[PDB]
Amino acid sequence: MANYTNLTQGAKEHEEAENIQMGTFMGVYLPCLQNIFGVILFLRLTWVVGTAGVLQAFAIVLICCCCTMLTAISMSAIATNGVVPAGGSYFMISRALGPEFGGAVGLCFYLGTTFAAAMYILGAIEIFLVYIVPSAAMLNNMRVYGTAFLVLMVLVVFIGVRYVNKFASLFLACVIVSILAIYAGAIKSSFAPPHFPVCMLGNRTLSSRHIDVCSKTKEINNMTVPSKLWGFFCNSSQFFNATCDEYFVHNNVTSIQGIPGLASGIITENLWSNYLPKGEIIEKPSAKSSDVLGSLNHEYVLVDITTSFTLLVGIFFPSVTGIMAGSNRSGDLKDAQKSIPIGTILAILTTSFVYLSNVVLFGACIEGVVLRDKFGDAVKGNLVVGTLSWPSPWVIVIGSFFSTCGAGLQSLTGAPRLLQAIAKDNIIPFLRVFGHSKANGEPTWALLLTAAIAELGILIASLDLVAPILSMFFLMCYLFVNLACALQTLLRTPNWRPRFRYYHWALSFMGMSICLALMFISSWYYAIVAMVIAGMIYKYIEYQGAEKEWGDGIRGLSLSAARFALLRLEEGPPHTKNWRPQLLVLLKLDEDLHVKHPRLLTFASQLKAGKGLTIVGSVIVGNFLENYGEALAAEQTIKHLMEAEKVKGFCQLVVAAKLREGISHLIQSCGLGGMKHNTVVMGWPNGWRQSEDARAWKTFIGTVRVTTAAHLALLVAKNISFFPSNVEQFSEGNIDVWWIVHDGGMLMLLPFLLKQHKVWRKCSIRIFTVAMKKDLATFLYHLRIEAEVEVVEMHDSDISAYTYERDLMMEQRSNVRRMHTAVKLNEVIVNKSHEAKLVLLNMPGPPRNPEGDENYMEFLEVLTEGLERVLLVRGGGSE
Amino acid sequence: MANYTNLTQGAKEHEEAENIQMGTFMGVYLPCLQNIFGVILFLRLTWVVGTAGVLQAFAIVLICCCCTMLTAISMSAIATNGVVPAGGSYFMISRALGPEFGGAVGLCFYLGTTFAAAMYILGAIEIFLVYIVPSAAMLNNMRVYGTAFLVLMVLVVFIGVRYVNKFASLFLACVIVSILAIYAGAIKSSFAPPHFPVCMLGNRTLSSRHIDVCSKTKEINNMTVPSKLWGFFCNSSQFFNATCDEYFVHNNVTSIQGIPGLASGIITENLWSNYLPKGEIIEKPSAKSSDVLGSLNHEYVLVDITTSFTLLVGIFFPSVTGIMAGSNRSGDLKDAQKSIPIGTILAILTTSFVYLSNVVLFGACIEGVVLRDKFGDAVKGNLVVGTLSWPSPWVIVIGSFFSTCGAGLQSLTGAPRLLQAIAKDNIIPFLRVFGHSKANGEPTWALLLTAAIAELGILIASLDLVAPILSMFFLMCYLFVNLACALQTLLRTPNWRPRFRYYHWALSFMGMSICLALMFISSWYYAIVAMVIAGMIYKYIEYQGAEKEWGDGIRGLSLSAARFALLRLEEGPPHTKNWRPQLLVLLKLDEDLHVKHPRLLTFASQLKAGKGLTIVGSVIVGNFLENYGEALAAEQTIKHLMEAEKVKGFCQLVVAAKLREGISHLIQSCGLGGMKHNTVVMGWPNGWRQSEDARAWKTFIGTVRVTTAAHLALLVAKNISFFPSNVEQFSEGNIDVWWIVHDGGMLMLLPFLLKQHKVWRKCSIRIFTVAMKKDLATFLYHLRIEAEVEVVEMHDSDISAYTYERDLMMEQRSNVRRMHTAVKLNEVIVNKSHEAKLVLLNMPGPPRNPEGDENYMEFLEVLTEGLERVLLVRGGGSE
Ligand SMILES: *[C@@H]1O[C@H](CO)[C@@H](O[C@@H]2O[C@H](CO)[C@@H](O[C@@H]3O[C@H](CO)[C@@H](O)[C@H](O)[C@@H]3O)[C@H](O)[C@H]2NC(C)=O)[C@H](O)[C@H]1NC(C)=O
Ligand SMILES: *[C@@H]1O[C@H](CO)[C@@H](O[C@@H]2O[C@H](CO)[C@@H](O[C@@H]3O[C@H](CO)[C@@H](O)[C@H](O)[C@@H]3O)[C@H](O)[C@H]2NC(C)=O)[C@H](O)[C@H]1NC(C)=O
Ligand SMILES: *[C@@H]1O[C@H](CO)[C@@H](O)[C@H](O)[C@H]1NC(C)=O
Ligand SMILES: *[C@@H]1O[C@H](CO)[C@@H](O)[C@H](O)[C@H]1NC(C)=O
């Protein structure tokens, strides 16, 4: 009806979409299914069931399926977020997780795929050599035949990939026919199981590759001659005073049925682990046996490797790898964000059900001795799982070989395409050589490097030793795919909208943890190497990206970090659960371009205590075209002064035509979006009455208006010349906070930030509240904070100029009286706090009409008449 | 003469220096020396040497000492950097590595010190019980007496820590006397060795706690009665028809000299590992032997644990820990940055020499069988190392017990002080309860928690199992102390000035690697757990510091990341090796407060490709006091427009009275210090002639002058209404770049960036150079990027307005002619590039006199007359 393929889509298929069909079954399901059903299912799954016991085999398959399923969930989250590129799964992963994670996952998955191309060649060779056409001799035969087969497959994928695309369907057909034959055999093995008997010597199993009858003597022409097995346990071969070894004279050779019925109940026997070390004779704990020993013979089927749990998990994991292949044919899709998750998860569920069912079927149909037999021995040299089939084990032994060579072709096509895709991106520079492609867009150098790595793999001519490396590389790939999603969900990474119905970051984190444990349990010494290689690739990609975009390596690296943090900072809830003063210190520069108030910087350092954001802003009156030299000079001066006063922050100078306009620009333009200030710290205009320039107090009140309108807090320090330094300290003193009717939050939060510094550390705090929603919060804060409270109530007229403005707020959401009341405020404040070390004090807002600015400044001046060091505070915002 | 201490200094002594002697030997040498020399040296060093063979024992001691030595170099780099706080080593590490690393190292070293207070109690109990006053019985005796001893020691520390301070000198005396006795025994043993004999039956070793004579018979009154050992090997006790066991009737008891002379040369025997598993009889491969076996008696000294190299390194590592104690008396110093490094390194060299010497001496003095005896048996139940001593083994048996009790006191005093120091810093919230102090400044609840954890340790009553956990915690502490220095040196962390003569970050990195390998080799089980615990505490401290300073958890976390990156960015070389345009798009806001040119944003997106820094600035004409609502509305509008055009960057609005002054403030003040821009992107003032308000071209040229003065690049896009959108593309075209005389960097770099975007991907590049060293640079760039070059020379007067400017540069380090030559430039440019999709084109500088501004604009308008899309470019800077 229709032709399809299961291979990948590299840069060749991506450049088509950059220059400018199938559903879920044929688009995402069949590709993932044909790539998960590897060779292990046919060559090591029975052996794993045997040497692990159905219970532990089920646990191993479940853990592997658990990591791969959680990784499928994370990969579906990656697939749904944003547009799905036309390329393979690598392009999706890159565009979703950034170039760093994209390249790390790409290289780990590529090493995985190369060693998979090696394992599948080794498996096809093992099937061809051992089962179809017959110690270290076997390893060298596998080496030479696997090298020949790899040189053949490389030429095939190099010359004629189109035929591989055409025959992918035949390979899938072979896989499915083989699995259905396995199931049909398991079923037919209920009533009529097959006739595969095994010669077993007591409870020690014998081979059958050369024996014919499981009897100590055969009878040709009524002559009780000794069977051929006599020649393998007795160096007499005649029975004429035969000198047989220990174990043979005592015990019995028996024809044990090798495949009992599915309902026979043999499962009760092999429900437990064996884990016998190397060279141990395989023992069935069912038949009778003597106790004599010593007869170490050649026909005893021996455990071929020192099996263990952590070894079995690694040997089995490369049968669940391949889930990223689900979305390696994503360019030819109709609804990608719908077709990819469903297809991938359904494929993984299908394969997990097949594996978990076959574990139990092998448990309950194959004898507990034929399962631990890792080379199909003891059954006259036929495939273990092959014995469970409807027609004959031949269907399985041919289907497995064709499937495994097809998967080898698949992995020698997907690995170099992925390598040219990682090369053309210029993510990693030195791989640029592999960016070269053929005329039709097929990799050439990538294919050669993949051939080299696959040959390196093949030189270890044993599935049991290649499987851990393959599994570790795919495990690292899945670990990064599971960790990047968790990170981008937690840290609110931009453009991370995982439009999935079931993806919760806990799932990806759980997958990361599960098969991180899998990596380490398999082999921690391989796993640390893999983690360090992946981390080095990740950091090198990050460094190259920084050098590419910003122009410098480490400079640009910190630049990228800052820019990314600021971006991530924008797309969030602009409010904060707590308010913290992030200061803009307004330093006034005299006509000599020196800081007219260093105590401003000293007090800012004492307020912020070396932490937080401090923007020191200053305006230089003049024309910028002919002042930039003076600008750089004064900026260096202010930076040196900031360093001298232990202020950590940034300096901004604006060369402006008018001081008021310069400061009005500074108050609203300082800081990059996200790193905005929230308070403006000003010095009081000392001698405003004595400076006949009418613009001093005007400029001050203008700055106050601009701050209030911008909804920033304001901290006007007065008599700042008498503020302390950083080296000196106070023996004993009282920070008196005079919280007038409104704006309590700042007035109480500041003296604690101050007393938390070494200078003001040894002083006490006294809250002289004068004028009840806010009242409750003060008690809670003072409980948080264990300072001292005090209430001093007075007449309403004295605080009229305050309450008036306060009233103006509630409806929103004279001068002679102001002066006659400010003196009352003076009376109380001095009579209580005259000898304080720092008096915080709430402020009234500036008048609406700019005419009473002289009156407002006189109000302030008299309000502060007689106090040593005053911190006028104004809220302005929400807090 | 002078009284001193070896304990630590917690918040008690730090608050004193915050409120406001000994040199190197008595200040930082002896405290470290008394604290490195622990119990292992006397109770397990001999067994380790025996079990490992002198070679592998030397390897163990060397690897451990190298880990701790590189950690000492990193710790000295920490000590020299900045003023050294008066508190313990914890305060130094905190003030040098930030509260995150400070708390992580503090807690890991604290758990280390607690399990050390447990191990030393176990050791004192083992010495008291096994040697001084005599299976699971031993373990339960150790549990009971260790719990009793911990209950006593907790009271001792709680009541009378001053006496621990007073008798630290006696403890050090005991340590050094024990070591000197070891050396005196070793030297004396050459000519005169002591008479410690060992019974040995063939090559199987016998015990000696109950047996008296190494003979199968003794003769009282000349009667051949069989020795007591006959009863322990024969159930007859009379020799009358003795039914003696197998290995006893055959072989020969021999009284082998247990301590042969240092000149005897036994080292040839015990130069090789034994690693015999649990329960194996200890064999000397020198004496004669029969071959029968089976008679597993109770008097055969056995291997008490399945020992391995990875186990021996863990068992021995808690003998090199203690270098952080070197600076536990850092408040009482004269020259801290000079005393601490030299003191610590000299103490570590002393202890390393002591260990590497005792290894070889035990190799050459103790029999190769008495070494593998882990409980001092076979020598009449005497301490194996004690046998090497001049006066008697009892000097060691007493000195070691007193030293181990003293080290228990030291580690039960250093752990609660450290815990209260971590608590009072408010680094971790929940530990606040442990900040509770006694009257004189001593911990109360921290002591209880330390006692609880030490008891949890003592429940494991075996040094061989407490040592790996102690070693893992101290190894994690050293790994963090090594990694933090390497990081802060690489990344150029602010205030990281390691004024040390020999510290290089490669040393700290090799130390981190060595000690990480040690962790994982010892037990990856505990290594992963410790790494995860320390990482969680680190991230949690970072989160708490964020929520403390910025006010929010994740918001504040990203804020802190950005602030730290920006700060790190300041203390560096402000120039970068490569020039990359970081755009400031000057968007023009109409009277409707709507962007008059979205194409500016589209083109900035195409130019930067969504990566890099893009600050979109705009001025609102008016007063800020009464426009803030309109300001926020237009800012939201511009943000929506930027997000619509895929522009990743920030937005800044300034409400100013004069558009020209607003722009002159934007250009020089945008961005936080470090994240400055270096290119200003403008839209051409279309219809400047048709506007009777001459302020259009005046403002444009003012902006150009400001950009030139600020030394920023300038990109004026003309006919921007024709610039393509994001969704469309160019099928084919040519970016014709006209590098006239100057600024080849930008003119060759911009079209490469543009062709790198999908819109301009399918177009080619043509350089129509018009006017030697600069031509060289062009060749290299074109070789790097593979674009097309071409040269079109013309007359000098035609480029007068350019070369004139050029002349002004050389000395640094008319209108009718310019116009009539501009039309010639027009003829060339149109004849070559009329149909070009985008003509880049160099700019002349604006006239020095502001009168020719109309003439300058007419010159530009002519120069650009007839072209579809022009990008006027001006370098301005260094590049
Ligand atoms: C297959 O047959 C062989 C030969 O009989 C089995 O080896 C023998 O198994 C018996 C089991 O009872 C072992 O006896 C054991 O001896 C130890 C030592 O005294 C005793 O503590 C136990 O209680 C038990 O009686 C016998 O030692 C062993 N022969 C050896 C090890 O040489 C083998 O176990 C059989 N396999 C299975 C799976 O049953
Ligand atoms: C202490 O004495 C015992 C008793 O003689 C030693 O056990 C025996 O050691 C000999 C060493 O020559 C072993 O001989 C070896 O036998 C194996 C297997 O037959 C053979 O392949 C070797 O080439 C060698 O001839 C003998 O098996 C062993 N007896 C056992 C294991 O039951 C023991 O080695 C002595 N210990 C030391 C440290 O010398
Ligand atoms: C071997 O078989 C014979 C007869 O079938 C039986 O008598 C004998 O007990 C068997 N041997 C064992 C060890 O079961
Ligand atoms: C035990 O000692 C006797 C007497 O010296 C000697 O003849 C015999 O060979 C020794 N046996 C062994 C096994 O060395």
CA–CA separation, B32 and B6 (whole Å): 8
**Ordered alpha helix ranges (H), A265-335:** 309-316
- Residue A197, beta-bridge partner list: A257
CA–CA separation, B119 and B113 (whole Å): 10
B754 with B787: CB under 8 angstroms?
A: no
CA–CA separation, B467 and B457 (whole Å): 10
Please name which ligand lies nearest the alpha carbon of B250.
4
Instruction: Indicate if ligand 3 lies below 6 Å from the C-beta of A252.
Output: yes
| Tokens at A390, concatenated | 């409807």
A473 with A66: CB under 8 angstroms?
A: no
Q: State how far residue A865 is from chain B, nearest Cα, in angstroms.
A: 30
CA–CA separation, B159 and B84 (whole Å): 31
Which amino acid, one-letter code, is at A48?
V
Question: What is the number of other CB atoms lying within 10 angstroms of the CB of residue A416?
Answer: 32
Q: State how far residue A669 is from chain B, nearest Cα, in angstroms.
A: 6
Contacts of B656 in chain A (CB under 8 A): 661, 664-665
CA–CA separation, B771 and B795 (whole Å): 10
- Nearest chain A residue to B523 by CA distance is A524
Q: State how far residue B361 is from chain A, nearest Cα, in angstroms.
A: 35
Residue B649 contacts by C-beta under 8 Å, 6 or more apart in sequence? B583, B613, B614, B615, B616, B642
CA–CA separation, B350 and B36 (whole Å): 10
CA–CA separation, A794 and A804 (whole Å): 16
Chain breaks in chain A (C to N over 2.5 A) after: 20, 134, 771, 813
Contact between chains at A561 and B563 (C-beta distance less than 8 A): no
CA–CA separation, A873 and B538 (whole Å): 37
Question: What is the number of other CB atoms lying within 10 angstroms of the CB of residue B596?
Answer: 16
CA–CA separation, A577 and A570 (whole Å): 16
Is A240 strand, coil or helix?
Answer: coil
The annotation status of B19 as a binding-site residue, yes or no, is: no
B164 with B30: CB under 8 angstroms?
A: no
* Residue of A746, A757, A768 lying closest to A843 (CA atoms): A746
**Ordered alpha helix ranges (H), B251-380:** 309-316, 336-365
B532 with A520: CB under 8 angstroms?
A: no
Nearest atom (ligand 3) to Cα of A289: 13
CA B123 to chain CA centroid, Å, is: 33
Q: State how far residue B672 is from chain A, nearest Cα, in angstroms.
A: 5
Q: Which domains does chain A have, with CATH numbers?
A: 11-193+304-547 (1.20.1740.10), 578-721 (3.40.50.620), 729-879 (3.40.50)
CA dihedral B646, B652, B656, B661 (to 10 degrees): -90
Please name which ligand lies nearest the alpha carbon of A285.
1
- Testing ligand 1's pocket by substitution, the residue of A51, A200, A201, A203 carrying the most ligand atoms inside 8 A of its CB is A203
Taking the centre of ligand 4 as the mean of its atom positions, its distance from the CA of residue A60, in whole angstroms, is: 58
| Tokens at B534, concatenated | 């320390």
Q: Smallest Cβ distance to B559: which of A491, A569, A705?
A: A569
Output the CA–CA distances (angstroms, integers) from residue A445 to A87, A155, A426, in the order listed.
Answer: 20, 13, 15
Backbone angles phi, psi at A220, to 5 degrees: -95, 125
Taking the centre of ligand 3 as the mean of its atom positions, its distance from the CA of residue A136, in whole angstroms, is: 39
Q: Whose CA is nearest to atom 7 of ligand 3?
A: A252
Contact between chains at B675 and A563 (C-beta distance less than 8 A): yes
Question: What is the number of other CB atoms lying within 10 angstroms of the CB of residue B787?
Answer: 19
Residue B431 contacts by C-beta under 8 Å, 6 or more apart in sequence? B419, B422, B423
Given the DSSP bridges, would you call strands A713-718 and A679-683 parallel, antiparallel or unpaired? parallel
H/E stretch holding A422: helix A393-424
Strands (E) across A764-878 are located at 764-769, 788-791, 838-842, 870-874
Nearest atom (ligand 1) to Cα of A203: 1
CA–CA separation, A489 and A786 (whole Å): 39
CA–CA separation, B386 and B395 (whole Å): 8
* Residue of A414, A434, A429 lying closest to A87 (CA atoms): A414
Q: Smallest Cβ distance to A551: which of B520, B578, B669?
A: B578
What is residue A588's DSSP assignment? P
The annotation status of B808 as a binding-site residue, yes or no, is: no
* Residue of B580, B561, B559 lying closest to B569 (CA atoms): B561
User: Among B95, B519, B615, B625, which would you mutate to test the A interface (most chain A Cβ atoms within 10 Å of its Cβ)?
Assistant: B625
CA–CA separation, B799 and B829 (whole Å): 13
Contacts of A786 in chain B (CB under 8 A): none
Residue A120 contacts by C-beta under 8 Å, 6 or more apart in sequence? A38, A39, A404, A405, A407, A408, A411
| Tokens at B164, concatenated | 């621990």
Nearest atom (ligand 3) to Cα of A202: 13
Contacts of B850 in chain A (CB under 8 A): none
The annotation status of A270 as a binding-site residue, yes or no, is: yes
Taking the centre of ligand 2 as the mean of its atom positions, its distance from the CA of residue A423, in whole angstroms, is: 60
Q: Whose CA is nearest to atom 30 of ligand 1?
A: A291
DSSP secondary structure letters along A143-200: HHHHHHHHHHHHHHHHS-HHHHHHHHHHHHHHHHHHHHHHHHHHHHTTTS----EEEE
Contact between chains at A566 and B562 (C-beta distance less than 8 A): yes
Please name the method used to determine this structure: cryo-EM
Taking the centre of ligand 2 as the mean of its atom positions, its distance from the CA of residue B710, in whole angstroms, is: 89
CA–CA separation, A415 and A107 (whole Å): 10
Instruction: Indicate if ligand 4 lies below 6 Å from the C-beta of B251.
Output: yes
H/E stretch holding B385: none
Output the CA–CA distances (angstroms, integers) from residue B793 to A86, A794, B769, B843, in the order listed.
Answer: 47, 88, 8, 18
B142 with B381: CB under 8 angstroms?
A: no
Contacts of A559 in chain B (CB under 8 A): 565, 569, 613, 674-675
Q: State how far residue A251 is from chain B, nearest Cα, in angstroms.
A: 27
Instruction: Indicate if ligand 4 lies below 6 Å from the C-beta of B288.
Output: yes
- Nearest chain A residue to B561 by CA distance is A565
* Residue of A549, A543, A556 lying closest to B749 (CA atoms): A549
Which amino acid, one-letter code, is at B660?
R
Taking the centre of ligand 2 as the mean of its atom positions, its distance from the CA of residue B51, in whole angstroms, is: 20
Q: Smallest Cβ distance to B551: which of A579, A628, A631?
A: A579
Backbone angles phi, psi at A261, to 5 degrees: -60, 160
CA A140 to chain CA centroid, Å, is: 41
DSSP secondary structure letters along B53-108: HHHHHHHHHHHHHHHHHHHHHHHHHHHHSSPPPSS-HHHHHHHHHHHHHHHHHHHH
Question: What is the number of other CB atoms lying within 10 angstroms of the CB of residue A147?
Answer: 17
- Testing ligand 1's pocket by substitution, the residue of A201, A256, A289 carrying the most ligand atoms inside 8 A of its CB is A289
CA–CA separation, A269 and A368 (whole Å): 7
Q: Smallest Cβ distance to A558: which of B565, B711, B758?
A: B565
Instruction: Indicate if ligand 2 lies below 6 Å from the C-beta of B203.
Output: yes
Q: Name the one residue in this structure whose structure tokens are 């093995």.
A: A189
* Residue of B839, B879, B624 lying closest to B735 (CA atoms): B839
B793 with B771: CB under 8 angstroms?
A: yes
Contact between chains at A762 and B563 (C-beta distance less than 8 A): no
Taking the centre of ligand 1 as the mean of its atom positions, its distance from the CA of residue A233, in whole angstroms, is: 22
Nearest atom (ligand 2) to Cα of B203: 1
Backbone angles phi, psi at B833, to 5 degrees: -135, 20
- Testing ligand 3's pocket by substitution, the residue of A248, A249, A252 carrying the most ligand atoms inside 8 A of its CB is A252
Is B871 strand, coil or helix?
Answer: strand
CA–CA separation, A842 and A838 (whole Å): 13
What sign does the dihedral B462-B463-B465-B466 (CA atoms) show? positive
Backbone angles phi, psi at B226, to 5 degrees: -75, 140
Q: Smallest Cβ distance to B672: which of A579, A631, A671?
A: A671
Given the DSSP bridges, would you call strands A223-226 and B218-219 parallel, antiparallel or unpaired? unpaired
Contact between chains at B670 and A669 (C-beta distance less than 8 A): yes
Reported for A355-359, long-range contacts at CB under 8 A and 24+ positions apart, including other chains, are A355/A41, A355/A45, A355/A61, A355/A65, A355/A319, A355/A320, A356/A58, A356/A61, A356/A62, A356/A65, A358/A41, A358/A45, A358/A182, A359/A45, A359/A49, A359/A54, A359/A57, A359/A58, A359/A61
The annotation status of B270 as a binding-site residue, yes or no, is: yes
